[PDB]
């Protein structure tokens, strides 16, 4: 944003926003799947207790 | 819903420099268009007028 001619900056900024979003989406999905496994483990732990 | 029209006199190299997203001398110090535009840029040679 402070380095490129503004219309070129706008395009590249949007490309990076999308890239950063994809990193967040990936993280959430992976943590969401892991959370399902952790919940199952917690349920087993609760069962054993 | 709305149409706006800017009617003005410029040089042929200046005609080339006026477009949405087009930066340059005329764009920043004389006649500016945005990086996001809906509309038409229309021009005619006026050597006889």
UniProtKB/Swiss-Prot annotation, chain A:
Protein name per UniProt: Spike protein S2'
Highest taxon of source: Viruses
Consequence of substituting residue 47 to I: In strain: Gamma/P.1
Originating gene: S
First and last residues shown, out of full length: 981 to 1029 of 1273
Entry function: Subunit of the fusion protein that is processed upon entry into the host cell. Mediates fusion of the virion and cellular membranes by functioning as a class I viral fusion protein. Contains a viral fusion peptide that is unmasked after S2 cleavage. This cleavage can occur at the cell membrane by host TMPRSS2 or during endocytosis by host CSTL. In either case, this triggers an extensive and irreversible conformational change that leads to fusion of the viral envelope with the cellular cytoplasmic membrane, releasing viral genomic RNA into the host cell cytoplasm.
């Amino acid at each position: 944003l402070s380095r490129l001619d503004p219309p070129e900056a706008e395009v590249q900024i949007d490309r990076l926003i999308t890239g950063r979003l994809q990193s967040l989406q990936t993280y959430v999905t992976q943590q969401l799947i892991r959370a399902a496994e952790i919940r199952a483990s917690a349920n087993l732990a609760a069962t054993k207790m | 819903t709305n149409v706006y029209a800017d009617s003005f006199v410029i040089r042929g190299d200046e005609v080339r420099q006026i477009a949405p997203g087009q930066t340059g001398k005329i764009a920043d110090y004389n006649y500016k268009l945005p990086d996001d535009f809906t509309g038409c840029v229309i021009a005619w040679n006026s050597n006889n007028l």
